[PDB]
Point group: D2
Chain length 377, copies 4
């Protein structure tokens, strides 16, 4: 038996040929089309919507969505493998894809009416329509202030969502808002379309990380939403969480792609650098640590993927892998950065935003601590 330094536990052999082909298709697309764009896309914060069509056309948008609705009807491991190949190039591109698949197609497929599913899903699956997802607000992460008023014909929406990836270029908007409906105040999901009166999506520029992805606001001022546009089959925490859980899973796989790019570059760098550097034992220890955390992270997300597919995965498990992948990836980017004398620095600032996106209070540690102790911090 021979050693594969780049795949010590032979993940490649733990996958079905099925999943390998999906991985290889995602790799071919990301390396062929995204890598030639990424440097100046990031450097100059370009808007590049053409990516939704490209991924849609080869069946990599909404991977778990059934063929009935235009999806490629794949499993969670394949979704994972796709995220990882996209983020290997850049987290901003993976972000764009996460939104479409997990934050837009999922809640529509899961909670929407037949009419909503057939109207929206097929066009989201091809990338003809671009989605975004409105949950997070100007600042307090349930405690949401965006509000729907029952009016003749449907609903009137007022509030503001902030840091919404895809929002300046989106055709479809999934927005979460409190509806006080006699005499109970619950969170409901609403579909809005581009050009809806009272709906704005201003762009945010001068971002520090995720510069390759166009991000903006969702500003709602008495924006009318017809009855047929409320998500009928969900209320409360279940709506937003189903989406977030799907997205966190993809990010857990994706951040390991980013970690792997940093690791490969660091390794190649020390192989090429005469001073060679590879003979240094502090350098060797760093490479051993990178290889280790990635190899173990990959076994975790693979096992989680398999459990999700078999229906045995509790939601708390996602907190372990997302938190671990993002944290370990950031550690690896910092370690690789500190070893260099372009790509790494990009992944590094991307990962700094990703690690802090869901707050600076370590939400996943708290989900896990509560799961262990019973007690909320």
């Amino acid at each position: 038996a021979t050693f594969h330094w780049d795949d010590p536990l032979l993940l490649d052999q733990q996958l079905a040929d099925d999943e390998r082909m999906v991985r290889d298709a995602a790799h071919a697309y990301a390396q062929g089309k995204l890598a030639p764009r990424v440097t100046e896309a990031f450097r100059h914060e370009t808007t590049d919507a053409a990516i939704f069509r490209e991924m849609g056309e080869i069946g990599l948008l909404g991977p778990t969505i059934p063929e009935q609705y235009g999806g490629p009807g794949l499993d969670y491991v394949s979704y994972g493998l796709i995220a990882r190949e996209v983020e290997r190039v850049d987290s901003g591109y993976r972000s764009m894809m996460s939104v479409q698949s997990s934050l837009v197609m999922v809640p529509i497929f899961e909670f929407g009416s037949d009419a909503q599913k057939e109207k929206y899903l097929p066009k989201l699956a091809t990338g003809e329509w671009i989605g975004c997802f409105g949950l997070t607000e100007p600042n307090h992460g349930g405690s949401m202030v965006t509000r729907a008023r029952k009016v003749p014909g449907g609903y009137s929406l007022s509030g503001s969502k902030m840091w919404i990836t895809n929002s300046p270029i989106a055709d479809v908007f999934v927005v979460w808002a409190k509806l006080d409906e006699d005499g109970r105040d619950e969170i409901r999901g609403f579909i809005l379309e581009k050009g809806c009166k009272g709906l704005s999506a201003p762009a945010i520029h001068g971002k520090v990380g995720l510069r390759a992805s166009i991000t903006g606001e969702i500003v709602l001022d008495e924006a009318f939403v017809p009855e047929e546009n409320i998500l009928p089959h969900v209320k409360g925490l279940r709506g937003p969480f189903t989406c977030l859980n799907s997205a966190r899973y993809g990010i857990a796989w994706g951040a390991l792609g980013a970690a792997e790019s940093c690791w490969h570059i660091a390794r190649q760098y020390v192989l090429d650098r005469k001073q060679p550097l590879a003979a240094n034992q502090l350098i060797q220890k760093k490479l051993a640590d990178m290889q280790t955390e990635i190899t173990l992270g990959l076994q975790g997300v693979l096992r989680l993927g398999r459990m999700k597919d078999e229906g045995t995965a509790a939601v708390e498990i996602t907190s372990i892998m997302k938190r671990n992948s993002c944290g370990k990836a950031l550690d690896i980017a910092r370690l690789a950065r500190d070893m260099l004398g372009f790509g790494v620095a990009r992944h590094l600032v991307n990962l700094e935003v990703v690690n802090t996106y869901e707050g600076t209070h370590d939400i996943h540690a708290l989900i896990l601590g509560r799961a262990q102790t019973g007690i909320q911090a």
Copy 2:
């Protein structure tokens, strides 16, 4: 929605074959039933109890991978892993005693020995009737064999040998003419002395000593015929390191469990300690590392059973398990206020320091071609 198991998030239990689950439960019932009530006083007073070898041999826990042909239970590598984890869950010293019999003594005889050696030594080693030790370390190896009528004559010293003062069987590595060879010696071989060493800081539950050799006659039927060079010792060490990778995770789990129960019990400014945000971070870290470390040694086990595992993978897992376990023992120790965990901690400081950072450098060479 599916149920979360905080103590087994990836449902390791469900990834085990039923065979493997039963081996685990058998080791668990033994270690919790026989070793746990002994451990506190044994560690405090460095009391030897070799009764463990006979006890473990009875339930077929020694030489787990050795075929039934030779008295062994004929289990797979995953089962070996599970046993070490259940034993180290109590104490690393008890696990060391077992690592030695299984990986350092029965493995070399089975892998490199003659039919005669295997039929003679393995069955009593498997039942724990004979106790084995592994003579490699020395106080670029000094110990030498020399050819004489009927056999060989050995002279030299081995130091820090676990099991040696109580061993019946000795697997000794000496240079012959210039290659390292393995020799099987018995207690009551003229020329062999095995004095004890006392007052260790860690692994106090096990007994360790020397092997002093002086014209010790080893008959012809007693040289290991099927190995020469670094392959002999390294094969044993590779086997032992695999069991230690699982074992350090059992010790890590105990520390995690103790720390979790501790913060559930103790109170701080009105709330239980478990309510603190910092405490939960630590519990989350302990849970994460244990859960991921387990998936690693399980995959390594599966690969060894299918013959797809290279030797470098063992380095990843042993270094990771021992390093993470040590981090968790320290985290747990630092979470306690006053003056089990302290014992696990000093044990894991010896385990981690034993072989420096040879594994990071093995992994470094495997990535880069260059040896440092």
Copy 3:
């Protein structure tokens, strides 16, 4: 232009001639009398009160206490140099000392009466009387006015020196509820001090409890010039200052042991070198901090929050260095279990981070 690996910033050169001999005095004592004792003392948790006699003999007890009361009349830099030389051998030893100096002789000197100071200090200085400090409980311990005198009742826990102490400085509450200081003496009825055995760290020091079952305390035994929080706190702040110097001595043993180890077989290893450099750096920087704190304490320019910086840093870094040294080996182990206790003695909630966080922000955690 000549480099000292063991003293990169030449602390020696920053010390007064007076201070430099006191350090070498505590060093000659610690290495001469304490080093040959420590291994077996720690091993069996043996009691040896001879150390109080010996340190007293040579003026290392209550070192800031004025010559008028039996003290050597030294300053804070000198006090720290002593703690550091003593802890360099063992933390348990330093603990016994810093109880005498900071937790017994300081509160008596600072808050005592003329008669109390004349009676207790001179004998505490020579080590003839051994003191202990009674603050920590399993605060509930109350003073009840009599007759006398006062009638104290309660229990103190983890009291170093107590099973062999002659003098007990006990802090209890009294209403007119304010915390007051009390002096008690061995033989006192209702007072008892049973030992505590089977410790993990600090085995070389003796520790016990203070059980007060309506112990009678004459009015000539209460501390007049102290009430409330600033009592215990003045003592603790004094001890914390000494521990900040001490932890660094223990850190230095571990570094020196570790450096010697890699020389005797390893020193070419770049991982090792990084580790030895980290030890060198943190100790070197730690010393500049405690020295500067000392100079400031002697000039009156030192605020109390500064003791939180240096104590937290010394202890935390010493523990890191002891663990770094241990993981390099194949004395350190004893310093390690000691430092593990020392880092958590004041709790596990990082009291000094919270003190400093508040000083920076004006907001309590």
Copy 4:
């Protein structure tokens, strides 16, 4: 009696009255003139040559250079305090200063002829002439003897100031019976200095190449009093001392920004400052800066009194930069959002410090402890 959270060991009071004045002048300048420039200068990688004359006119260039040659004749502590007030704004600005001081003025003063020192130093001191330091390559750069002097052929990479420099201190190998230092001037035939743009860190400083193609150097342009390693090393040792102070200015900025952030920000009803972990991090930042400052101070004094070995600058540079980078990362990870607010001045300090920490010392201390090279 009173705690000073921003200066717990009152470093202020450990300074001579002379050193304090110099610090206040560096502060007033950097805050007055550099703070308003930085955000846009860093964003667009803007070139402002004018800063050298500004720094020159207040005697911030070549602080240790004697008054005889236009220097302000200050001590090492003062040089340190200057670098710290400048890097408090931005490492890119400090990088310009330390190149002029330690990498251009120092080799000429230390190793140059008397005619070189009086030709070059007074103009370098006023900022009339801008200098650069040609050591790093993509050593191969070669000086060869020709009638009248030397011909230089070679190529230097990542040379800060090079595209705007009037004076080039170029280290090249010359064969005599070894590394030699040469002085070149702007406009020399066979000398070009193309700029590098698109940098990740240190964007506020201009950096470029030195390309030498048979560049003729007069005989009186070779540095007469240095051969081999000690030349480039002495400059770098000087620069390293300045970097050790500057890095702590940067760290102090990230610390201050993080502290104000948690003051202005609320989370779950309470201000962020009330969070235990936040307080720990702020205690760590305060601790490492305070101790870092005591270290660089003591090093300066030793350098002034002439008792510091080269090894001590290694420990101080490594520590300052390594701790400054930890503090920047600690501050960064405390901030929510993505670039728009003031607090993301921390992101700027961070990419700067990632380059500074990269621009060996642990192996110096290891070998100095042990006598064994690794």
